[PDB]
C-alpha cells in the first residue's frame, strides 16, 4: 500500500513478478485480510474499506461510514465486523459483506488524522491514537473505554500489538519508543530507543518482534526477547461537555441573523410607504395648496 491509487500485489515472497490492481485514487492505508482472506481489505482513498476478493474486478464491498478517511482497515475474527480509523477522529465499526455500520466511536478522543487501529486478539476492544498523544482502548458497540494509554508527544503516533494482545508497541514520528503491558495497564518503560522514529511496529506473525521505520533508514529488525480507573475520570469528566455546549448556541444564531435577516424585510416593505402616502392622504396635501392661495 502506497500513493498508488491501486494496490500492488507482489508475488509470493521474493523476485519481482507482479502488477497493478486498481483501487481508488490515492494513498492506501494499512490493509488486512479476513482470516481465510477470501477478501483482502484495504483502506483505500475513497474513505472506504474495500473488501477485494483475493484478486477480482469491480469491488466486493466498499463502505464509507467515515467522514474523511480510512487510516486503518482491519478485519476481526469470527466476526462480520471490520474497524478503522480516520481523520474525522472517529472510529468505525462496520460489517463488510453487509456494508453497514454496527457502531461508531467519536472524539474515543482523537485530534487529527487517526493512526493504525488495532484490536484485541478477538477483534474487539479496539485501539487507537492519532496526532494526539494517547491511546484509547475501547470496545465494540459497547463503545466504552478501559483506560487512557497516554502515548508519545509525537508529530503523529503509530502502533502494533503483540499477537497475544499483551503489548502495545507505541511508535510515532518522534524517535522515542515505549512499550505498554496491557495485562497490567502500566507503561512497562520508555525504551532506550536510540534514534528510532518508528512508523510501524508490525510484528512477526508469531512471536518476538520489530520496531521499524524512521530516520535511521535501515529496517530496524528487533527480536524483542521479552515477548515470551482513569476511565472514571472521563465519566463527566467529559460526558456533559457536549451538552453543556449546546443551549445558547442556536439562540445566538437565530438572534443574530435569523432575526436580523427577517428584520430586513421590514424595510423591504416600509420602503414603499410613500406610495400610499402620495395616494393615501394626498387629497389633503393637495387641497391645502389652493385653499391656502
Amino acid at each position: 500500500c502506497g500513493q498508488d491509487r491501486q494496490i500492488r500485489l507482489w508475488q509470493n515472497t521474493v523476485q519481482s513478478k507482479c502488477s497493478i490492481i486498481k483501487a481508488h485514487c490515492g494513498a492506501i492505508r494499512s490493509m488486512s485480510f479476513s482470516a481465510d482472506g477470501g477478501y483482502l481489505l484495504s483502506s483505500s482513498d475513497d474513505k472506504t474499506l474495500k473488501l477485494w476478493r483475493l484478486q477480482d474486478k469491480k469491488f466486493m464491498c466498499s463502505f464509507a461510514g467515515h467522514k474523511n478517511w480510512v487510516r486503518s482497515g482491519v478485519i476481526s475474527p469470527d466476526m462480520r465486523l471490520v474497524a478503522s480509523g480516520s481523520d474525522d477522529k472517529t472510529v468505525m465499526l462496520w460489517d463488510l459483506n453487509f456494508q453497514k455500520i454496527v457502531s461508531k466511536y467519536s472524539t474515543s478522543d482523537h485530534m487529527d488524522t487517526v493512526s493504525q487501529v488495532l484490536f484485541h486478539p478477538d477483534g474487539t476492544c479496539l485501539i487507537s491514537s492519532s496526532f494526539d498523544h494517547k491511546i484509547k482502548i475501547t470496545d465494540i458497540r459497547s463503545n466504552k473505554l478501559i483506560q487512557h494509554y497516554n502515548a508519545h508527544d509525537a508529530q503523529v503516533n503509530s502502533i502494533s500489538i503483540h499477537p497475544t494482545g499483551y503489548f502495545l508497541a507505541s511508535a510515532g514520528s518522534d524517535s522515542k519508543i515505549k512499550i505498554w503491558d496491557l495485562r497490567q495497564g502500566r507503561q512497562i518503560y520508555t525504551l532506550y530507543s536510540n534514534d528510532k522514529d518508528i512508523t510501524t511496529v508490525q510484528f512477526n506473525q508469531s512471536g518476538d518482534y520489530f520496531a521499524t521505520g524512521g530516520s535511521q533508514n535501515l529496517c530496524m529488525v528487533w527480536k524483542t526477547n521479552f515477548d515470551q480507573q482513569p476511565k472514571l475520570v472521563v465519566n463527566n469528566g467529559t460526558a456533559t461537555y457536549p451538552s453543556n455546549f449546546v443551549p445558547k448556541v442556536e439562540e445566538e444564531n437565530i438572534m443574530t441573523e435569523a432575526i436580523a435577516a427577517s428584520m430586513q424585510q421590514i424595510y423591504s416593505r416600509l420602503d414603499t410607504m410613500f406610495q400610499y402616502m402620495t395616494n393615501l392622504e394626498n387629497r389633503v396635501v393637495q387641497s391645502e395648496q389652493l385653499q391656502k392661495s
Binding site: D153, A154, Q155, S173, D174, K176, T190, Y192, S193
Partner: protein, 209 residues
C-alpha cells in the same frame, strides 16, 4: 524540524536530552519551560522572578534534572520527581558574580564556569560544589570540555596551556582529602558549600510533566 520562537521574551537558552528526549528552553525572563519538541507545544510553563542575561540550560542525558546559569549570581536546579520541576534556587559560594557555563556529566554533577573565572564541579544531589578550579591572574582559565566516561578533559586556559586531565582523576583529591576528613567526620555540606534553597522571590520555579 522546528523553529521555536517568541513574540517578545527573548531567548536565552535550552537543550535536548541525550539518553532520552524532552526539550527545555528559557527566556531572559528566567522563564524556563518544556516543549514538546516535536509538536511545538509548550506543555510545561514557568514564570519566574530571576531574570538572567545569557543564561544557559544544562540538560541531563536522562533529563530528570536540569540546571540554569546566567548573568546573576545564582544557580537553579530541577528534579522531575518533585513538583514544580524547578523546585528551588540558591545562591552561590562567595565571590561568584554570575555563571557563564554549566554542563552535565554522568554522575549527579555539572561543570560550571563563572564570570569570576573560577570553575566549579557541582553535585546536584545536594546542590553543593565538589571541585574548585583556579589559575594565575590574567592569563587565567577560559573554558572547558568534559568527556563523561572518565570526564576526559580539554581545558583552555588564558594562561595558554592546553590541558591534559581527567576530572575523574582529579576527583581523587576530593575523594581522598574528604575521606580522610570523614574519619574525623567532616560534613560535606560545608566542604562543598551546599547552597541552601531560598525564597520564592528569586526562584525559577517551574511545573513540568
Amino acid at each position: 524540524i522546528k523553529t521555536l520562537f517568541a513574540k517578545a521574551s527573548y531567548f536565552a537558552t535550552g537543550s535536548l536530552t541525550p539518553n532520552g528526549q524532552s526539550l527545555i528552553t528559557s527566556f531572559q525572563d528566567g522563564n524556563v519551560y518544556v516543549w514538546n519538541l516535536n509538536n511545538f507545544e509548550v506543555t510545561a510553563k514557568s514564570e519566574v522572578e530571576e531574570n538572567m542575561k545569557n543564561q544557559k540550560i544544562s540538560v541531563s542525558a536522562d533529563s530528570s534534572r536540569f540546571v540554569i546559569g546566567g548573568s546573576t549570581a545564582y544557580l537553579y536546579y530541577c528534579d522531575i520527581s518533585h513538583s514544580p520541576l524547578c523546585i528551588s534556587s540558591f545562591a552561590l559560594p562567595s565571590g561568584s558574580t554570575s555563571v557563564k557555563k554549566i554542563k552535565f556529566t554522568h554522575g549527579n554533577y555539572l561543570g560550571i564556569i563563572t564570570d569570576n573565572q573560577v570553575f566549579y564541579a557541582i553535585d546536584s544531589s545536594t546542590n553543593q560544589i565538589a571541585l574548585e578550579f583556579r589559575l594565575p591572574k590574567n592569563k587565567g582559565i577560559t573554558d572547558f570540555d568534559i568527556n563523561p566516561n572518565n570526564l576526559e578533559i580539554l581545558i583552555v586556559s588564558g594562561n595558554g596551556e592546553i590541558f591534559k586531565y581527567d576530572l575523574q582523576k582529579l576527583f581523587i583529591m576530593e575523594m581522598n582529602q574528604q575521606q580522610r576528613l570523614l574519619e574525623r567526620g567532616i560534613e560535606s555540606s560545608l566542604v562543598y558549600n551546599v547552597l541552601k534553597p531560598g525564597n520564592q522571590n528569586h526562584s525559577l520555579k517551574f511545573e513540568s510533566h
